[PDB]
């Protein structure tokens, strides 16, 4: 029997299994990775602590890791992103998983801590992260365990106080040197998303990064696929399920025109909205204008737009003064990694009327209302099902290759305590594994053609500086 | 005083050229703002710039920006069909030496290139501004042979190659001993516009044969992600319509390559109503095309199917004689990469050509099926229409102007070695900012805490050097 898990309802396991099987067909990169590396067992002996949205897509990633020999414990990286049938299927598979759609913030962080209590005794020796939270727990406890505890008493956020309480409690409950023990045993971390990678470079630059990191976000086959087309498909998906609103003929405002903001603006435009964009980057703003988006300030958009999407990875994008100016029943959501892009806490003395899970109506003093999705959390994961499997297969094949490099291909210490990206050969290899399913017929260079443009026939085909 | 130091189709076109230059000025705020900012400061006073770059109206605005900054100038076009004759006439009528005719011969093309280096008043140039690297390459071949390596000069390859070798020997015969070493020593740098030219530069740098510092303007974000992409999106179909007047809605089009030019070319045709198929050798680029809903096929798959074919690779031997034998009657074939060997045009000389109009030819095969060829396989957007529109050229040419300033005025301490550089992101962002007012953008300003929160200064730069946009 198996009891080392927390999920919503284990009876959803058969439903999750059915959808996982369907996803496998949609994820040739992961399936082909199992076929190539399965016999090789490169992950035998790995103890991977995973912190990433516990979805059906993630379930295929987890079982790819296992098929390569990895021992695993897993949590979601957001309180609303778990798909409970995915989590149930992983638990029924005998993998410790702690993930519930709609868990509390305190549950979220205690579940993260369970990553590090390994079954059979000990600690993990790998981390797979999305947003850096698990990585941040190891570094925060380590910093405190070494005596610099001052920051632990100086919070300024609901989440951050809960997080600091976790770190104190772990220091009080766990053996000496538990964080030093963890930090010693972690061979590396692979990080999924822009915000988490930002956290890594803050540690790298300060000289506090405790183990090698691979930046999976900046694989071309991640950042130019997941962030772009993934959001192009899943943003309006989340809006439709939450609101069932007609998109044709409405005006939408997207804050940000990086990879996520580009995909977000395209999602709304393709659905029929007239899309305006904000930006602070003059290059990205010129991109938005040349694509036919009107580029305006949030002050300018607030009285006018029917729908608002923050996509910046920054904070305080949609403020309480913006929401006071919005038309009655304007829709507001967030597709960046963290909820502080919208001033959700400034709304809490207002009347909230819940409509359905992850959909609330908020009334202002002058009677106008707004429709908030997922309380400002990631709308594509909170209100729909995240990115579809196929594009997630590209991201998670990168993730698996990153795990293999850090765990198995660091005998010569080629990875120091810095942040790395996968080589272009592996980036191109990820793309190759997805060509058959979509029906691409790749042209083969002749040798004189390859010489002509200065590449080998087998690649890589571009300079490391190429932007695609 | 009278001015005679030029070669143009017809100098009576100058008033016409001047009118369209004036209109282009309004569409190129980046160059006009650069004039306002740098004119008074005269950063290129003393510069003698040899320019090899499509002699279009857009280029004329660049020329007069360089002049307004203090530069002394001589200019030629970098393709036999890309010149706009009214633009060349306006530059000549302004007293600027220029040698460019739309439809010039290959022999004329290289003879005019050599004329850039005989400077009015005596002497040589001290700067080069290049598009494709022909002018740079004439210097390095001449220098290389002036040193002693005479071998390569007696090996053809194509028709152009033979002519090009013939020029350097004539220049070795007629000019004083040491002429090329003396050019090479006075050239303070070169700025290069295009992907093929930059590939030529890096190949020289890796071989240790690059003679002077070089700035890769192509790989500024405000160039490659705008000019190459949106420019071709607007001027490819423009070239096809003017050449053929064909209905694009309903047709199947094939684009070879899905780099920046291929991306913009496929978009040009899709937006015009075509169903677009694409070829690629790069699996990442091919995956991008398929995620945009383009069918990714081989040129052999497309030959009997597509109504229109566009090569956009910067490679060679993309559309072969075997492909063209397979094409349906009166398929349209053209090329938007920098050089004309993407299509095996030489192989087509064997068949019966009927000229339709300038830069449009019908070619008949033994079984009587025919194809329509645009610009004899040269750059279709510049041969058959007017190249990229002014506004997107303003970004590219502001980059060129800043690159000329860097190499001519900001290299007193040799901070630029004999290597290939790109412009800093601060200048890349600068270029974009100069175009925001014209296109109506209202930029948001970060507050101090928001700038700290994402790790940037309020005034930028906003992205890591690794950022792909
Ligand atoms: N929901 C998802 O499934 C998903 C997927 C990938 C990434 N993300 C997250 O989305 C966020 C954005 O990621 P990204 O890859 O697009 O990063 P990015 O750096 O590529 O783009 C962010 C853009 O926001 C702009 N910006 C910053 N502050 C702004 C402001 N005050 N006003 C207007 N624009 C501003 C920046 O100039 C930048 O161009 C991150 O938090 C990332 O982790 C979410
Ligand atoms: N006409 C214009 O106005 C204009 C403007 C800019 C650049 N150019 C020229 O266009 C050419 C392409 O430039 P780019 O910036 O797109 O370079 P790029 O490297 O970004 O794109 C070229 C693509 O061609 C692909 N390719 C190479 N050989 C191939 C083959 N045999 N079959 C299919 N695909 C193949 C490469 O994989 C690559 O993705 C260059 O010569 C450049 O100088 C023309
Ligand atoms: N479906 C998904 N699964 C996991 N992480 C995701 N991030 C975005 N979409 C996702
Ligand atoms: N109109 C134009 N002028 C100069 N160079 C160009 N390259 C592409 N289009 C051009
Ligand atoms: Br109010
Ligand atoms: Br035939
Ligand atoms: Na999904
Ligand atoms: Na033009």
Author numbering:
A (entry chain B): 6 to 473
B (entry chain A): 5 to 473
Task: Share the article's original sentences.
SAH, which is formed upon methyl-group transfer from SAM, must be removed from the reaction equilibrium (which is shifted far towards SAH formation) by its hydrolase (SAHase; De La Haba & Cantoni, 1959), which splits it into Ado and homocysteine (Hcy). In this way, SAHase is a key regulator of SAM-dependent methylation reactions and of Hcy levels, which, when elevated, are a risk factor for neurodegenerative diseases, neural tube defects and cardiovascular diseases. A typical SAHase protomer is usually divided into three closely connected domains: an N-terminal substrate-binding domain, a cofactor-binding domain and a small C-terminal dimerization domain. The substrate-binding and cofactor-binding domains are separated by a bipartite hinge, allowing them to oscillate between two conformational states, closed and open, during the catalytic cycle.
The incubation of ligand-free BeSAHase (§2.2.2) with Ade resulted in crystals with a dimer in the asymmetric unit, from which the complete tetramer is created by crystallographic symmetry. The first four residues of chain A and the first five residues of chain B are not visible in electron density. In each subunit, one Ade molecule is found in the active site, accompanied by a sodium cation. Also, one NAD+ cofactor molecule is found in each protomer. Moreover, 570 water molecules, plus two bromide anions and five ethylene glycol molecules from the crystallization buffer, were modelled in the electron density of the solvent region. Ade molecules were found in two structures. In a pattern of molecular mimicry, four water molecules imitate the positions of the O2′, O3′, O4′ and O5′ atoms of an Ado molecule and create hydrogen bonds to the corresponding side-chain atoms of the protein.
